[model samples]
Target: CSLSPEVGEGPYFIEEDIIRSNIVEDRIGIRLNVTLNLVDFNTCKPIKGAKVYIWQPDYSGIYSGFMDKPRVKREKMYPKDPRRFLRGTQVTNENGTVTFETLFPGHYPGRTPHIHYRIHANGNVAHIGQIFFDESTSQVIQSKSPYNQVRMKNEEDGEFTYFNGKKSIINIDPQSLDSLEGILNLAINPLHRSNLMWA
Candidate 1:
């Protein structure tokens, strides 16, 4: 009965024209294979031709296209990161699945490790939710170099705890030493759509 819950879009969303599976953009981290399946909540059937959009922060805990001060207050910062790396869009196929090859996102202050995603179909938005990671897996992954730089200190983020939390987590299976696979199926009611608010 695990289902996705609507959540805020945060402050890093941006409209883009890229339509590809790989969104690493030359960044370095544990490779992640994200596969999301769209289904109808009422009929429990696949929803083909739907659009899936996903975005997440990089290893440095900084999202692309944001000019806000870094984790620590800085004297100077760019107006925008200017690198649209981890965000991308893909249309669902006949099987109602969309896959993306990207890096594991790092955590930031006041926020648990997660990925933002939106589902669209027939010119309307069906759902918007954040995919979470289990505390054990999150800790293990962040223990590495780049991620270790930031202490694993935000596991109690309200957004995560208040929502589905463990239910929102995408089950990940280790594929190899340097890569893993995550699978999450979303039950979206295409007939219950509204004006799309995602970019």
Candidate 2:
């Protein structure tokens, strides 16, 4: 089961905001539609109303505000890149689903092509995991290099347990970047009363 930390809601959540408008289209990045299959750790039931936070690296293989010297040039790729790119959160609905409009993440030197997502609700961390791209995605990001060494490291790291990689991912057509469906599912416990109290 995936588990995240209890990071309280941030002050910038836009309630039920239209996620489509948040899509990022850098000339060098491949945008993708990602969905999470959230399940109750105990019952394996879907969790609705869970708050999820997701963010990923820009085309230059750099995350926003990381203060790493490399992210500087990445920001230059988009003189007007939002302070944060592809970063947002949403609450699951009655169907135990939530979605975000985000960019296809770019790969960095040491990390595989992936997205960082954290899910939380109730009084504890619900899920914390990275969504890895499939063979095609890795090819584009790595310029045809799968980084077998990196894959090995991932296998050694227990953190790679939550996901089934490309086999479990839902692909989104990139023909129309404006229209996307990055839907996700999560585990929820009705017994806990942590309302969707986000910005």
Candidate 3:
């Protein structure tokens, strides 16, 4: 059940819990726990055993995968270590749920605050896009709420896009809590069995 190369398809994939067990030492600088749900694209069934990868910018709006520091005035920096920062992977359990140990993502410009994820399972390729902040965070970031200390959006990247605000869980306000976790739902498109024939 793996996916073949489709012009519109590529390796991309795209959390909600708080438990003491969610804490990971040394790696996650803060208590920011990430959670994802594994849902079948078609049946909407939860699929277990899938692999999830999550990456995001630090509190300072810097990503370990590219441009070490916050791009000042949109000039351009250099790519840094892709393996460093809040980079980690998790596998779904029997409940089709996976969690990540990471920090709260900074509210970068243009795009809302979010986290990037990749899910692979059933021999299919699915890209998990950014997960957005909850309602409590939305107001704070906008400066109309209690947690008005949070900064506004930073800069937008040409290769970056955001998930619809209506269906995401990427809370931006740090005052709410430093740690967050949730499940990542994936949509698996079944392969065409008829395409395979024994020679």
Candidate 4:
């Protein structure tokens, strides 16, 4: 039921992994709850204790780990602050579930609104990929005030189209007016030697 391709970690993945369930830093946007279940492709079982790291942009399309201008048109830059928001790591429970709380990520120029995530099992890199939002969902969320600063769309972005071709989109469910949920079941081969990079 899964065939998503592995993608790069982008420019904002901090090497450090912080253990937390809430990545929201008082950002004014729709709340997003992300849950992931890691399964061993070799054994078809849940992988407990797997490390899952995830990061994403804020409502103004700004990442926390880099020193760049605001991705939105009217926002200012924090040259001195390397704040780590909308990013954290969690270990899977017995059910292979890990959850995170953050805002709906805003879109940037060259790519669609997405979240970057990595999975590590048995001290090896099991997966390095992204989770894309539905275009309809993005459109709805971006129609609001702060996220409206974004000018990009999923269909117009080449990287998003490529990800669509690879079936990498996350299936999201609405929980409330200010909250949403998404789940990802990662299937990985722990013994795959080539999948050893970021762990």
- Top candidate on TM-score is 1
Model 1 scores worst on lDDT over the 10 consecutive residues at 70-79
Q: Candidates' TM-scores?
A: 0.85, 0.58, 0.58, 0.83
In the range 79-157, model 3's lDDT, one tens digit per residue, is 4444355556777788777766665565454445566655556645354445555645544444532223343332242
Worst 10 residues of 4 by lDDT: 70-79
**Best-matching candidate per lDDT:** 1
Better of 2 and 3 by lDDT: 2
Q: lDDT of each prediction vs. the true structure?
A: 0.76, 0.49, 0.47, 0.73
| Candidate 3 local distance difference test against the native | 0.47
Q: Global lDDT for candidate 4?
A: 0.73
| Candidate 1: segments with Cα more than 4 A from true spot | 1-3, 67-81, 151-155, 175-178, 193-199
Give the CA lDDT, 0 to 100, for residue 183 in model 3. Answer: 43
What CA root-mean-square deviation does each model show from the true structure?
4.3, 8.4, 9.2, 5.0
Q: Residue 51 deviation, candidate 1, in Å? A: 0.9
When summed lDDT is taken over every stretch of 10 residues in candidate 3, the lowest stretch is 5-14
* Per-residue alpha-carbon lDDT of candidate 1 for residues 47-156, written as tens digits (9 for 90 to 100): 89988889998887777777354443223333366788888999999888999999889767778888988777887777777888867787888888778875434345
- lDDT tens digits, residue span 1-199, model 4: 3434677665566756789999997667778888887777767787798888998888777777653653432233233356888889999999889999888887566677888888777887777788887767767878887787646566776765654523666678765545788876777666554342332
